[model samples]
Target: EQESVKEFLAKAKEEFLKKWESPSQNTAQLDHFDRIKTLGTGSFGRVMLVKHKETGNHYAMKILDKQKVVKLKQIEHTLNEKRILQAVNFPFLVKLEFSFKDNSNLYMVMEYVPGGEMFSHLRRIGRFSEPHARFYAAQIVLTFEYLHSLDLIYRDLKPENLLIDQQGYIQVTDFGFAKRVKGRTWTLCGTPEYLAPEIILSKGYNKAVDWWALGVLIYEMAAGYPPFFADQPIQIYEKIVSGKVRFPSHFSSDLKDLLRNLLQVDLTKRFGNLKNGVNDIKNHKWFATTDWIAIYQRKVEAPFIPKFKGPGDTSNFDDYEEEEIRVSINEKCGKEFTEF
Candidate 1:
């Protein structure tokens, strides 16, 4: 009976992967969308605000250069990101509407979140009230819970990866650092201030690292900066390993207690790492006012909404110098890079 069950599970996994591994037939071509402006730039490529000619709807098109991707040996990471994006189906997560590959580039068309990065808003307004912080944190908790359910860990959880929607709700984006980790992983990635002690110490880490990052983000949101920060990366890593976090004098006892539990240096004693899992966080006194059911149902009203001219508004995002279109394939990158 156990053998049969194992075979069934293996077959199911194969079927699921086969179905989602490639772009569907309806995936939009590059020429089908008109680029409005550059959203952001990264080493991999850039994201652009685009409008589909047929659907007349706006979308964020992430275009990655194949040559650079191969040169950096990021093929696996890029594929993993695409697979995870295809699998994710949550309200708080960014939706991948389409994915395709041209000779020179890989494209992912996603829902155009008009409100822009939560980091911008956080920087513009120095800090958030405890209530406001709780609102966004609760949504992120849901996102983490969902990811962990699928055996994935989101290594990156900084404010910059979070997008604010028109409704002012949180939308967790950028899965470049996310990976499926059933146990421990040795990858040392993520921002300096948000790095957990285990990661800094080279101890294999799991989903617990995300809980640690959540603690840092919560502190940053409420206090206008991370709990432990330094000018240099090495200094920041030292502080993280020390695990000595200082809270502002104005912080409430409940907030401090929550941060303490989440940022526990001992992974075994971390709040989310415990047997109760995310329940320990959802049931904390700091989130006493949060209605988990209402939050998931989208019944909770957002505290702030961005000024909108229309559905395609880009006012919240910073302006960037327009880049010239470069779509030619690098001839040297032959069949060795065809899998993506």
Candidate 2:
């Protein structure tokens, strides 16, 4: 049944392509541009696998609709995403090359991550081995280190937002909710299951939220779910505020201890809340034995990589073309959308 649907969608997409003309760009379109496949969808638009007509370099074009941006008040959010992405250059984070506008939509050209989301690997493998978890954890810790150094906090950190590149390296994306909070916190946004205790209580938070989310991510990576999970948001909130972790018997002592320390709801005692902040988490016992150099170099063998047969293969991704490409051409190309 799934295969049949995939075939149907492919045919439908092909038919749609026949009627859709290639849009214009401020930067002249390569004479040989080709739409490969639909990558995924966002709140307002869709992403696509596009190849440069001249260079043949493939890119993930995240197109956002101007009308939806205004309607949803996502102008600030979208602007922030592009700003942060453009400012930072880290191996563990996704890179945004350039942005443009066409008609009623905005297009952001980004590095195409061929490996898909990190959740897919976890779902397929059931759970990560200790070494495997260590590999990913190390990378994330490095990411959080850089983010916190900039006094920016990634309020949302989950397997779903993590992507693997074709080279088997993890790249963090989706910065719509990210904020630069040096010493203040006003928003109460984030996935409930990953919220820090202080965030749940509305007591204000700092970059420590990233540390707390990191702990939850590690636990989920091993257990195939979060430590404090419930069917509803309210229930999940209660579980997080209570700050209790129910570990299975199979979990190793090292893993259990790390989760306990990092998940400390006290915030003050949270693993990275000490004098060094993220440095404290990086040097934690669980990652003590990990060869940091090897992990960063992508020498640690990843369990999976995207099975792309060619430059534009996106067969494994769900339909994200419509939801992420809603931005109009005029808005993105205009002077108002200048890089910060």
TM-score of each: 0.91, 0.83
For candidate 2, what is the lDDT? 0.74
Cα RMSD of all models vs. native, in order, equals 4.4, 11.8
Give the runs in model 2 whose Cα sits over 4 Å from its true position: 1-33, 303-306, 320-340
Candidate 1 residues lying further than 4 Å off, grouped into runs, are 1-26, 329-339
Q: What is the lDDT of residue 70 in candidate 2?
A: 68
- Global lDDT of each model? 0.85, 0.74
lDDT of 2 at 202: 86
For model 2, residues 60-119, the per-residue Cα lDDT tens digits are 877677667767767767766665665666678888766656657666678888778888
Q: Write the per-residue lDDT of candidate 1 for residues 241-262, one digit (tens) a residue.
A: 7868899998999999999999
**For this target, which candidate reaches the highest lDDT against the unseen true structure?**
1
Q: What TM-score does candidate 2 reach?
A: 0.83
* Lowest summed lDDT window (length 10), candidate 1: 17-26
